[PDB]
Amino acid sequence: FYVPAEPKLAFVIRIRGINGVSPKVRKVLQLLRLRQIFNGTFVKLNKASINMLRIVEPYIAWGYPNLKSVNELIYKRGYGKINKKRIALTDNTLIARSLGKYNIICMEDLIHEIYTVGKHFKEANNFLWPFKLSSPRGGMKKKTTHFVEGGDAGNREDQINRLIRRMN
Amino acid sequence: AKSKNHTTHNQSRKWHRNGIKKPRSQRYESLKGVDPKFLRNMRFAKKHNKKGLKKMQANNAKAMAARAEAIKALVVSRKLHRLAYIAHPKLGRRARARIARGLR
Amino acid sequence: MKASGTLREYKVVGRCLPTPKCRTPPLYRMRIFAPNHVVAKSRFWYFVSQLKKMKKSSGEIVYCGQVFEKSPLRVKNFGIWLRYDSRSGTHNMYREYRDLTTAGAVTQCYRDMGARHRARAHSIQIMKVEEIAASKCRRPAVKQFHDSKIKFPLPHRVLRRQHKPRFTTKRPNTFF
Amino acid sequence: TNTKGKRRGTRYMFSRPFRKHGVVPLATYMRIYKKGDIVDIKGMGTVQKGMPHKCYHGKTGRVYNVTQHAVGIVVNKQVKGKILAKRINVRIEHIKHSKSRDSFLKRVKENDQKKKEAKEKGTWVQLKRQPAPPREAHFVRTNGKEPELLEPIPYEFMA
RNA sequence: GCUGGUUCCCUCCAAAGUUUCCCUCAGGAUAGCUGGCGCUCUCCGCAGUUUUAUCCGGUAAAGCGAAUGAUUAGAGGUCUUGGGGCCGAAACGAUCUCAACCUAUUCUCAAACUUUAAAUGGGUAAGAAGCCCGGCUCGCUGGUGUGGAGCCGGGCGUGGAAUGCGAGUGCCUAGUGGGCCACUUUUGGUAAGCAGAACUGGCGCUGCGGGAUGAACCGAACGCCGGGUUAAGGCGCCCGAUGCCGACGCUCAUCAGACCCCAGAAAAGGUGUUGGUUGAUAUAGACAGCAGGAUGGUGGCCAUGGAAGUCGGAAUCCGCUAAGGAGUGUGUAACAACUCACCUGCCGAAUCAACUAGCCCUGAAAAUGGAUGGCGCUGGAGCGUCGGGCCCAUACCCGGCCG
RNA sequence: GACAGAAACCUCCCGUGGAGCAGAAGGGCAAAAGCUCGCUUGAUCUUGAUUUUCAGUACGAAUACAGACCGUGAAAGCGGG
RNA sequence: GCCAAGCGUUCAUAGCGACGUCGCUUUUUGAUCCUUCGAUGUCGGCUCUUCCUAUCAUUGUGAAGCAGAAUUCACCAAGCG
RNA sequence: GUCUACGGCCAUACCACCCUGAACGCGCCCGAUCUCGUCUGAUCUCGGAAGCUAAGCAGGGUCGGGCCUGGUUAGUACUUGGAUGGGAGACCGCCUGGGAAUACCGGGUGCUGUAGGCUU
Ligand SMILES: COC(=O)C[C@@](O)(CCC(C)(C)O)C(=O)O[C@@H]1C(OC)=C[C@]23CCCN2CCc2cc4c(cc2[C@H]13)OCO4
Ligand SMILES: [Mg+2]
Ligand SMILES: [Mg+2]
Ligand SMILES: [Mg+2]
Ligand SMILES: [Mg+2]
Ligand SMILES: [Mg+2]
Ligand SMILES: [Mg+2]
Ligand SMILES: [Mg+2]
Ligand SMILES: [Mg+2]
Ligand SMILES: [Mg+2]
Ligand SMILES: [Mg+2]
Ligand SMILES: [Mg+2]
Ligand SMILES: [Mg+2]
Ligand SMILES: [Mg+2]
Ligand SMILES: [Mg+2]
Ligand SMILES: [Mg+2]
Ligand SMILES: [Mg+2]
Ligand SMILES: [Mg+2]
Ligand SMILES: [Mg+2]
Ligand SMILES: [Mg+2]
Ligand SMILES: [Mg+2]
Ligand SMILES: [Mg+2]
Ligand SMILES: [Mg+2]
Ligand SMILES: [Mg+2]
Ligand SMILES: [Mg+2]
Ligand SMILES: [Mg+2]
Ligand SMILES: [Mg+2]
Ligand SMILES: [Mg+2]
Ligand SMILES: [Mg+2]
Ligand SMILES: [Mg+2]
Ligand SMILES: [Mg+2]
């Protein structure tokens, strides 16, 4: 048997709202930059981040995104945090002026860093403004339950790609 | 007319609203509460630092000299590599100029 | 577990992580019926934790693959041994079903148990399923179909599509 | 309400462990404490002199004054919504060194040696601690034997 | 210190019912929660978080063949003592004993017991204020310029875990100091829409979609609008959406049932019906069904005025047989007599028993007429497990405008 | 082991505390914190710091020192109830 | 209401039913203090209407340790007293 | 191999019984004038060296008790977070993570520092 290397990049979406949230869960959501409902962000996976996701399991849906998912997210809803403003990535000079020090110049190698995390994944992801995603067209299954029990919360392994397609 | 006696209900929210701040820390901590004998002798040492001044400056002069003479006696692919070198504004200037001259 | 849609058969293999005590632990495989591979692996961890001294964190999934049926075009009798939690106590049960696929038989069993005992897929704990020769079947509801010259009419055909001609002028016919 | 007594509720806290009563060993007295050392507080019922209050049991502080039989240490105590760094005087039997700082000292000296060396060599060395990474791809050899099947067992009312 | 009233607009921020003290409990002072005005910096620090090390704890669990305190039952020893006796004037000489005692076991426990002992949790650390060299001062400490402390001078940047975030700091300050509710923990009480606590979130101060209706329930929090999509909940008609040729079953109620909080029911039963578990017997032809025989020792004995197979108590086996029990019952002062068990005759395929679990029924009675929301619904418009499609919130996405 | 005994006194053995430590309970303690002796008055004079309740106010109580003058012991030490 | 030791000369269950155990009711009394102190007229009797059934009698029935007579248990039943 | 003096960790070192101890040592042992202390030279103190491993002590042994450390008990008990889950309730199942303790069955039975001897 060949056991493939377990994934090192994750996509996380806030599924539930603001009202009635425990302090620890609220703090971890602030640390993951999911302050509004249907924000998405890329998280690179290690013991610490996995435990944080475990803590905030009921409030998020997360999985392993495809390269196509990365492309769709970055092109369709890609905004940059320039001068702590939300500037739309409409050309390459915006990326170059804020990230050229990391020899990532264009949209293609921004996507390459995010997909194959590389070294300056922290800086690239922090440059990326959190994605604002629409409501899931067609409808969720059950917001309040784990995906294993036929809900939507928890850890989809790779169905997050269908979720991303349906939510863009 | 009995009423409620004790409660700590909203107190965690009240405290964390302005936050639980770790106590202020400074590089130098005050000398209050230490052993009086210890403090007396330390103040004597501070008082008499002055009388050993000239020896320290002489030794420091010799040390700086000796270390001065010591230090004096001691004294991805190639395609992308070339393309990045050319695209460099200061380093690729000559290459871009040569390409322009070649296109003539 | 939620028995969503038609179930599927999954071969799931797994083992403990290599420890300094033992270079390689034994491999364990299991047949699991689940809507998809995520819940299949979840159920694998549930069952192997129940049986052996294993956990999701201290073990790893090695191969999780769907198992296709070797004869999806011949009708078969399936015997199912299972175990469920009623309102008062848990019981072992043996049941007979008759269809094309093992996964179809298992999902039919889930529907039947829900309909007849109000049991639910989380309480139901499937343990064994075997294709049974036609002479070893025990229940009349499946044995009465073991007639080579089987013959029956369709007596009372209830009208469907009763809203397309919503206001008709003919009394519908039920004999055909 | 409760009583404002000093040792209220310390019944299991200040007692000695099982079969460890009697005379206190001498290494506890013989260990030396410089100022600035990180110290764990743990009250002992055998000695009633210089005994810390029950709210500092299990806490960790920093030595600032060393005296003949006790040390003065600075510990953080949390009151309603503020934290106070306050001084206590604890006799030696209620005191230990903490190994948390020792781990850091070992790690920093090892980084220092690995930085001074392997610098003239010119190679790059990782000095930070990255967290536990996801596992890498590998093969599992089922040499010979086939993975043996598991099935749930039938219920038996062993109660 | 107690009632009532307290006069224009818009914009921004926005609480408390808690701590300590008071002849204090309908009130104040005080800390906390708020606002306003700034200032010092920035373009190293911090955190209602995880990780890597390192300590701390005596709750849940468990234990009583481990301490303390309970507590059940049998064993095996003995003269270690007492008792009921007997042979013994007596005799640890002996007999049984009953006891206490001791030794191994055994049933059940503990908020104010405990050898063990979690989960969640509480500290600390994760560097530049750090490491590494050299030299001066000391009246402290000293076998020893020993120790320790403090000063000088120089050298080391891969800023030494993850992630996120601009921080620090000073004045002046109003209102508040009746709280209430919910998941899990929990004390008093039979219990309470009762009284009292812990943690978190709400209501108060808050509108909006759903729960028909509702302060706190589920979703979601709000500038004025257009388009799209969803949450929870729904899609016979009221009423937007199944007017799908939806899938598989269960259920008939002369009181059906019909969705968190929530607005009603239990023990016990049913040959009503549907699943299942275990044990029997059946082609040497089972269960029905339609019939024959129930016979001798022996009217057996201890027994009763009389009981003979039929009221009562130990007994309760034999040859005849395909078969008959020293008898299951009916009836007699006892018989008689009939019948039941046994096995054959006819026909010929599945049949009995004990449990167990789903829906339905009995249990099930209050006062104006009556409420799955109503109508109404039974090839469900009921219950269980499921699939597509569809409906809409002030939520989410795109756009316009105001601040 | 005379009187002597259920229980007076003497001797040996076992004895982790099942005793005692003024009092309520909890903790602690065995060449001792218990028992018996010897000497004594640290239950004395003085200025600060800190802990406990806490508002980090007071009182009360307590803890480490420091400076005198003493007690005790061969001494290290211990002692300002 | 459920179980069934016993009573009922026989016989657990015609009629009862101990030791136990499960409910309903709000015509008793308690428990609480949610509404009402800038007032909702307190006990009884009289008068008058309506409603409930947990049925005393009357209509129709089933069981008795119902021969008849009288009398007990139960069912549909609040129409009329 | 081992002991003595002083120890560190304080049962893997304890307890009961049996066996063996070469050399040095450690002890038992012989006495009371002196120092010293008792009702008693028994203890303590002092002065010795005829004898002795009998004991203490060291090593070893016991299908030893105890103690230390594993397996099982057991993914059981319990528990973080979740659900418009079940149930009249009492309570229970699942998802997400963590995870014990008896009984029973094994293994082991002191390491070690400073100074000084013995093994001519
Ligand atoms: C004109 O005022 C009146 O009618 C007279 C009056 O003051 C008289 C007082 C007294 C009854 C003690 O004589 C009164 O009746 O009291 C209150 C009243 O006022 C209207 C209404 C109340 C409130 C709710 C119903 N209930 C009705 C009667 C009542 C009866 C009582 C009782 C208290 C009340 C009170 O306690 C003992 O029995
Ligand atoms: Mg909510
Ligand atoms: Mg649509
Ligand atoms: Mg919720
Ligand atoms: Mg109050
Ligand atoms: Mg007042
Ligand atoms: Mg006063
Ligand atoms: Mg008022
Ligand atoms: Mg406690
Ligand atoms: Mg308990
Ligand atoms: Mg209350
Ligand atoms: Mg108010
Ligand atoms: Mg608010
Ligand atoms: Mg609200
Ligand atoms: Mg309702
Ligand atoms: Mg709209
Ligand atoms: Mg509706
Ligand atoms: Mg916009
Ligand atoms: Mg002494
Ligand atoms: Mg002094
Ligand atoms: Mg009788
Ligand atoms: Mg009240
Ligand atoms: Mg009136
Ligand atoms: Mg009036
Ligand atoms: Mg009636
Ligand atoms: Mg002598
Ligand atoms: Mg010897
Ligand atoms: Mg010997
Ligand atoms: Mg042993
Ligand atoms: Mg040694
Ligand atoms: Mg020799």
- Dihedral of alpha carbons D70, D71, D72, D75, sign: negative
CA of A83 to the centre of ligand 14 (A): 36
Joined tokens for residue A85: 């403003």
> Contact at 8 Å (CB) between A125 and A114?
yes
Paired tokens of A80: 């940059």
* Residue C41 φ/ψ, nearest 5 degrees: -65, -35
Which chains pack against A, by 3+ Cβ pairs within 8 A?
A: C, D
Integer Cα distance of A155 and A147 in angstroms: 7
For residue D132, the SS3 value is: coil
- Alpha helix (H) residue ranges in A8-152: 23-31, 47-55, 67-76, 93-99, 107-115, 121-127
Residues 2-31 of D with CB under 7 A from strand E: 12-13, 17-18
Residues pairing with D79 in the sheet: D82
CA distance C33 to C39: 9
Determine whether the interchain pair C127/D151 forms a contact, defined as Cβ–Cβ distance below 8 Å: yes
Spatial distance between the Cα atoms of C33 and D47, rounded to a whole number of angstroms = 66
Tell which D residues from 5 to 44 touch B, by Cβ distance under 8 Å.
none
Rounded CA gap, B28 and A133, in Å? 52
For residue B5, how far is its CA from the centre of ligand 8 (angstroms)? 20
Structure tokens at C18: 């290599």
D6 CA → ligand 21 middle, Å: 74
Ligand nearest to C-alpha B5? 5
Return the exposure string of D77-106: e unless at least 16 CB atoms fall within 10 Å of the residue's CB, then b. Answer: beeeeeeeeeebebbbbbbeeeeeeeeeee
> Pairing between strand A2-3 and A9-14?
unpaired
Percent helix / strand / coil, chain A, rounded to 5: 40, 20, 40
Residue B29, chain D, CB below 8 Å: the answer is: yes
List chains touching B (3+ CB pairs under 8 A): D
Mutual orientation of helices A107-115 and A67-76 as an angle, nearest 10°?
140
- Nucleotide closest to residue A149 (CA–C1'): H95
- Chain-chain contact of D150 with C52 (C-beta, under 8 angstroms): yes
Task: Collapse the DSSP code of D84 into the 3-class scheme (helix H, G, I; strand E, B; otherwise coil) and give the result.
Answer: strand
Q: Does D130 touch chain A (CB under 8 A)?
A: yes
Beta strand C28-34 with A85-88: parallel, antiparallel or unpaired?
unpaired
Q: Quick check: do C and B touch, 3+ CB pairs under 8 A?
A: no
Tally of CB atoms within 10 A around A110: 23
Q: What is the CA radius of gyration of chain B?
A: 35
Structure-block tokens of residue D99: 């190994």
The letter for the amino acid at C4 is S
Contacts of C48 in chain D (CB under 8 A): 150
Residue given tokens 């086939």 in the structure block: D146
Half-sphere exposure (CA, 13 Å, Cβ side) for A102?
A: 18
The nucleotide whose C1' lies nearest the CA of D15 is F27
Contacts made by residues C57-60, CB under 8 angstroms, sequence distance 24+: C58/C16, C58/C17, C59/C14, C59/C15, C59/C16, C59/C17, C60/A3, C60/C14, C60/C15, C60/C16, C60/C17, C60/D135
CB < 7 A from strand H, the residues are A 22, 54, 57-58, 142, 144-146, 148-149, 154-155; C 1, 42-43, 45-46, 49-58, 85, 87, 118, 120, 122-123; D 19, 25-28
Q: How far apart are CA A25 and CA A15, in angstroms?
A: 13
Name every residue whose Cβ is closer than 8 Å to that of residue C47 and which is 6 or more positions away in sequence: C30, C32, D150, D152
Q: 3-state SS of chain C?
A: CCCCCCCEEEEEEEEECCCCCCCCCCCEEEEEEECCHHHHHHHHHHHHHHHCCCCCCCEEEEEEEECCCCCCCCCEEEEEEEEEECCCCEEEEEEEEEECCHHHHHHHHHHHHHHHHCCCCCCCCCCEEEEECCCCCCCHHHHCCCCCCCCCCCCCCCCCCCCCCCCCCCCCCCCC
- First-residue to last-residue Cα distance in chain D: 46
Distance in Å from H64's C1' to D141's CA comes to 50
Whole-angstrom Cα distance, residue A43 to residue A64? 10
- Residue C36 neighbours by CB under 8 Å, 6+ apart: A159, C8
Residues 6+ apart with CB under 8 A from A137: A166, A167
- Do A43 and A49 form a contact (C-beta atoms < 8 A)? yes
Tokens 């020769």 label which residue? C133
By what technique were these coordinates determined? cryo-EM
Q: Is A34 exposed, middle or buried (0-12, 13-18, 19+ CB in 10 A)?
A: buried
Whether D42 contacts D91, CB under 8 Å: no
- Under DSSP, is residue D4 helix (H, G, I), strand (E, B) or coil? coil
CB C1 within 8 A of CB C34: yes
Please tell me the distance from the alpha carbon of residue A123 to that of residue A128, in angstroms, as a whole number: 9
Residue numbers in A near C62 (CB within 8 A): 1, 3
A137 DSSP 8-state letter: T
Taking the centre of ligand 12 as the mean of its atom positions, its distance from the CA of residue A18, in whole angstroms, is 26
> Length of chain A, please?
168
How are beta strands A2-3 and D138-139 bridged, if at all? antiparallel
- Beta carbons within 8 Å of D58's beta carbon, 6+ residues apart: D40, D41, D42
Enclosing H/E stretch for D111: helix D99-116
Q: What is the chain B residue with the closest CA to D36?
A: B29
A51/D84 Cα distance (integer angstroms): 31
Residues A62, A11 contacting (CB under 8 angstroms)? yes
Q: Is the CB of B64 less than 7 A from some atom of nucleic acid strand E? A: yes
* Alpha-carbon distance values, A145 to A26, A31, A154, C10 (Å): 19, 23, 8, 24
| Structure tokens that stand for A136 in this block | 């899931």
For residue C122, what are the contacts with CB-CB under 8 A and spacing of at least 6? A149, C1, C2
> Which two structure tokens, joined as six digits, stand for C151?
């013959």
Q: Residue D112 in 3-state DSSP?
A: helix
Give the distance (Å) from ligand 9 centre to CA of residue D55: 15
Instruction: Supply D83's token pair.
Output: 């934290």
* SS3 state of residue A53: helix
* Rounded Cα distance, C44 and A148, in Å: 12
Give the 3-state secondary structure of residue A110: helix
Residues C123, C84: contact at Cβ < 8 Å?
yes
Q: DSSP letters of chain B? A: --------SSHHHHHHHH--PPPP--SS----SS-HHHHHHHHHHHHGGGGGHHHHHHHHHHHHHHHHHHHHHH---HHHHHHHHHHSTTTTHHHHHHHHHHH-
| Helices A160-167 and A67-76, packing angle to 10 deg | 20
Query: CA D18: distance to chain centroid?
Result: 21
Cα–Cα distance, C97 to C80 (Å, whole number):
8
Tokens of D112: 């220092």
Question: What's at A128, amino acid-wise?
Answer: L
Nearest to D59 by CA among D85, D30, D32, D28: D85
Q: How far is CA A140 from the centre of its chain?
A: 18
DSSP annotation of A41 reads E
CB contact under 8 A, D149 and C31: yes
The answer to whether the beta carbons of residues A47 and D135 sit under 8 Å apart is: no
Distance from residue D88's CA to nucleotide F23's C1', rounded to whole Å:
32
> What are the C-alpha distances in Å from D77 to residues A139, B21, D66, D83?
51, 12, 21, 6
Closest to C105 in 3D by CA, of C73, C139, C83, C129:
C129
The H or E element that residue D101 is part of is helix D99-116
Distances (CA, A) of A76 to A36, A85, A114, A164: 19, 18, 15, 12
Chain D's closest residue to C13, CA to CA, is D147
**Alpha-carbon separation of residue C19 from B29, C15, C119, C126 (angstroms):** 50, 11, 41, 32
Residue of A28, A23, A111, A85 whose CA lies nearest to A62? A28
What is the C-alpha R_g of chain D? 26
Buried-state track D30-52, b at ≥16 Cβ within 10 A, e below 16 = eeeeeeebbbbbbbbeeeeebbb
Other CB atoms within a 10 A radius of the CB of residue A167 amount to: 19
End-to-end Cα distance, chain C: 44
